[PDB]
């Protein structure tokens, strides 16, 4: 990144819904190179999300993730800067997954199903992370 401008590698889409967005979500959730376990958790959690909200699968996911995407993010200056779309939903998924690891329910599919459900009416923890980022970039708006 000093010299080298880079390409990017192409991820295989999701084997159930053909969604590269959700494929990157199971990669954000995956730990220790165990992808089968993570996609089991995502299928269970989003399956109960689609059953609970009654909408559908990945539009319930796309709404619950649309409520947590940051708009802009932050001598030592904390300047506000506009987030790129790939970084936008990358941060969305990282905050959903991290907040779901913070929760105190039983299984990971329930922690993440309840976190996406708490983000569908935007009252969970990842929305507090988004409002926190937006308070930082809103307080420091004076630098552009």
């Amino acid at each position: 990144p000093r010299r080298r401008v880079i390409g990017q590698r192409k991820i295989l889409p999701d084997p159930k819904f053909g969604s590269e967005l959700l494929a990157k979500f199971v990669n954000i959730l995956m730990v220790d190179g165990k992808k089968s376990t993570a996609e089991s958790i995502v299928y269970s959690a989003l399956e109960t999300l689609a059953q609970r909200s009654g909408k559908s699968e990945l539009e319930a996911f796309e709404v619950a993730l649309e409520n947590v995407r940051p708009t802009v993010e932050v001598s030592t200056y904390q300047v506000p800067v506009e987030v790129r779309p790939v970084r936008r939903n990358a941060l969305a998924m990282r905050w959903i997954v991290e907040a779901a690891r913070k929760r105190g329910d039983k299984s990971m599919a329930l922690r993440l199903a309840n976190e996406l459900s708490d983000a569908a009416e935007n009252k969970g923890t990842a929305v507090k992370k988004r409002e926190d980022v937006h308070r930082m970039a809103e307080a420091n708006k004076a630098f552009a």
Binding site: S75, N140, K141, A142, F143, A144
Partner: protein
């Protein structure tokens, strides 16, 4: 109240703070707003953003007068001033004159020493 319908926006941009005073053509002030009185104390009260929100806030608080035309008089240098007049024609004012009235001595008083920083 009193219904003046034309005024002057004296903007006093300095390096540390911009202070916008909307008056009439007689020179009697109708309401003012400073960049330091709009939140952002300190390194942030001398920015074009702070000056523009100071000017937005000075456009409010003269609604009681029905000002439509105004001249702009600009003092001092500053990160303000330019953005400041922008905020004024973002607040429905018909901006008529823009004079720059910075006081320049004709080699008068001795300026202070300073700044071996």
């Amino acid at each position: 109240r009193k219904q003046v319908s034309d005024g002057v926006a004296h903007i006093h941009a300095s390096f540390n703070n911009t202070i916008v005073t909307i008056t009439d053509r007689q020179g009697n002030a109708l309401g003012w707003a400073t960049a330091g009185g709009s939140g952002f104390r300190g390194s942030r009260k001398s920015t074009p953003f702070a000056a523009q929100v100071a000017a937005e806030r000075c456009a409010d608080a003269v609604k009681e007068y029905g000002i439509k035309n105004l001249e702009v008089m600009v003092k001092g240098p500053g990160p303000g001033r330019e953005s400041t007049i922008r905020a004024l024609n973002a607040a429905g004012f018909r901006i008529t004159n823009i004079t720059d009235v910075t006081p320049i001595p004709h080699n008068g008083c001795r300026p202070p020493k300073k700044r071996r920083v």
